């Protein structure tokens, strides 16, 4: 549900001491993709067709 739930389950108790605690850092969503490098030559399939 939230970070405090993970912090409670990290100590295996309903009671934890006060203070600063490191918690799971989140990640921003990717904005897209890029697909480009040196190609443009077709592979040979003429004797196959």
């Amino acid at each position: 549900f939230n970070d405090l739930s993970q912090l409670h389950c990290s100590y295996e108790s309903f009671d934890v001491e006060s203070g600063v605690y490191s918690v799971s850092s989140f990640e921003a969503k990717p904005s897209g993709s890029v697909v480009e490098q040196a190609e443009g030559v077709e592979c040979d399939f003429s004797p196959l067709l």
């Binding site: 203070g19 850092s25 993709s33 040196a38």
Partner: protein, 177 residues
């Protein structure tokens, strides 16, 4: 490698300066592209550091661009006992990231509250205060501390300096004891 239709989706200049998942013809990953000066061998088209991590790429369209990572927010929390109060800190980052692009589990709500800039980053869940505390029990970072009440709120105060008892120095033959 295969090919697809492009128009303007897969151009480096199109998605410049954003976190994108690059798939450069057998090099798959995520990161942010940026305009850099041309460094390294042109024909190899892949520059690496000593840790086998891709540093940049020579574009067919243009030239060398840098890429580092898809950098995001590291998150820390402060929580007080006997008063169900908590606040979130994002270290070493300006107050520039908001609830839109999240990941992991979820995030908690405070009350409905501006994101406070601080030397240790950007903090949500705190309010400014012109107060000084010399006996801080929640050392937040640098000279910043969190102060509770006795359903109140969570205050941000500056960790002050206990100024010692000043005495004057004499230039004469007498003395100030």
């Amino acid at each position: 490698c295969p090919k697809l239709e492009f128009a303007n989706d897969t151009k480096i200049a199109s998605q410049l300066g954003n976190c994108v998942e690059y798939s450069l013809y057998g090099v798959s990953g995520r990161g942010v592209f940026q305009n850099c000066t041309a460094v390294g061998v042109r024909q190899q088209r892949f520059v690496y550091d000593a840790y086998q991590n891709l540093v940049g790429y020579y574009s067919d369209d243009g030239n060398y661009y840098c890429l580092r990572a898809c950098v995001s927010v590291p998150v820390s929390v402060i929580y007080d006992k006997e008063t169900k109060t908590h606040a979130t800190l994002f270290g070493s980052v300006a107050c520039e990231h908001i609830s839109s692009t999240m990941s992991q589990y979820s995030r908690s709500t405070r009350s409905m509250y501006g994101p406070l800039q601080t030397p240790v980053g950007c903090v949500l869940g705190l309010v400014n205060s012109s107060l000084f505390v010399e006996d801080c029990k929640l050392p937040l970072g640098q000279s910043l501390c969190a102060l509770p009440d006795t359903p109140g709120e969570m205050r941000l105060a500056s960790i002050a300096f206990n100024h010692p008892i000043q005495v004057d120095q004499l230039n004469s033959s007498y003395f100030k004891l």
